[PDB]
Design a protein around this ligand. Structure first.
Ligand code: VO4
Ligand code: VO4
Ligand SMILES: [Ca+2]
Ligand SMILES: [Ca+2]
Ligand SMILES: [Ca+2]
Lengths: 247, 247
């Protein structure tokens, strides 16, 4: 397969390097990633200014470039100016840290894969669920094994797989639904040298999902969480009720 | 919905034309069919040489392409190259003549639909059960109506519907099982101008199925035969016996 590999931690992250190398053992791998820290950038794109690319070195057989854009920008550039519009699979990661629940909306890792979904290209976002002690090779190894056991015809149009791999011992994997895991954010106030106050964003996690098949619960149990997600945010149930009340 | 229409007689067949046109009245239809005769081609596919496609005209409303491949090749090409992996339904037909019993293994019509089933795409193989005097419109009209009343969520994984429509009167439809209808075939031997003998395959049909709910019996009684089939040939009964006998 012609695979495009990107991430949000920069082309110099161990997470993307390990992943790119392993996939190159049996696939035509191309790497187009950000040249800096792009975490928490969500699905932002660059349209007001020019985008720049730089050919870098990852390992022979692997064509790589760094860009001044976001993960989503990287996928757009890779598709049109690097891969001749021929991409069989996109893998964004391996991210250092989990991307579950509502946090996926501000996730740069997920955004890369989601841009692929928007372009209707099979895409996967993969994250190592332990920021403090990530396991990049383990997550990449899981992906290799997963590909040999996953039927992409079952991945609907415009859909991607958001994968979270537990750092410890993998007991297995489960197809999950996105949880409503979110945060009760708050700010710590401080004062600058020039007397102006500033704020640091902090927060306490909220894990109150009642369903057992949600992402974080599987990861918590030592299972890889695999959620099929797509760029369609319509709340169907709400729309149906709204249409019943308003004619 | 996005429907892929194909067949095994050729993109210039009256059976596929009538079907595409009628379906294009309410759906976005794409036609990808063989550029020549493909009856009796079974589930063959092209892997040793390249495949080619040609844009052709069928109706100012349908996107059509002929290919140098088999019916199964047509579906693969349609799904991966023409329809951008966006196929809601696959309809192979309307074939001139029945496709029942063991003949479905040699059927190019069934093969196209089976390729769809293998990708878990709702698929239908449809034939007008009368080679001599077929009724393409009647079969097509039946399908249109069938699509408005059948719930495809009832189709198990990897399962397609093999449909045979009576050429005369359609008293109604009934779910059937594949029969063991086959042929007492032999060869008509002849001699060429250069003294070498050649063989013409010939045969008389065999209808000796005792079961009452088989395909040809339904068609014979004026009912549309609808058989749910899948790509699994294991003889469970026999497997059970051989197991309890040896090991
Ligand atoms: O670092 V993420 O933006 O992909 O959590
Ligand atoms: O022409 V068939 O191969 O589908 O009887
Ligand atoms: Ca990150
Ligand atoms: Ca035919
Ligand atoms: Ca025979």
């Amino acid at each position: 397969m012609r695979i495009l590999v990107t991430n949000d931690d920069g082309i110099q992250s161990k997470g993307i390097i390990v992943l790119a190398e392993l996939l190159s053992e049996e696939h035509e791998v191309f790497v187009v990633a950000p040249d800096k820290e792009r975490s928490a950038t969500g699905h932002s794109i660059t349209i007001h200014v020019p985008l720049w690319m730089k050919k870098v070195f990852i390992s022979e057989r692997v064509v790589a470039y760094s860009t001044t854009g976001t993960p989503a920008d990287c996928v757009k550039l890779a598709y049109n100016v690097v891969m001749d519009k021929r991409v069989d699979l996109i893998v964004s990661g391996v991210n250092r840290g989990p991307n579950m629940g509502m946090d996926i909306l501000h996730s740069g890792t997920v955004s890369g894969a989601m841009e692929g979904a928007m372009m209707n290209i099979p895409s996967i976002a993969i994250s190592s669920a332990n920021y403090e002690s990530p396991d990049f090779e383990g997550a990449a190894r899981f992906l290799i094994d997963f590909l040999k056991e996953f039927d992409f015809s079952l991945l609907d149009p415009f859909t991607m797989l958001n994968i979270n791999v537990p750092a410890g011992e993998i007991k297995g994997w489960r197809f999950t639904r996105q949880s409503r895991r979110r945060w009760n954010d708050y700010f710590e106030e401080r004062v600058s040298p020039f007397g102006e106050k500033y704020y640091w964003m902090m927060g306490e996690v909220i894990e109150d999902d009642d369903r057992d098949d949600v992402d974080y619960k599987a990861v918590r149990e030592g299972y890889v969480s695999i959620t099929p997600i797509h760029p369609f945010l319509t709340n169907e149930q709400c729309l149906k009720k709204l249409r019943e009340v308003y004619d």
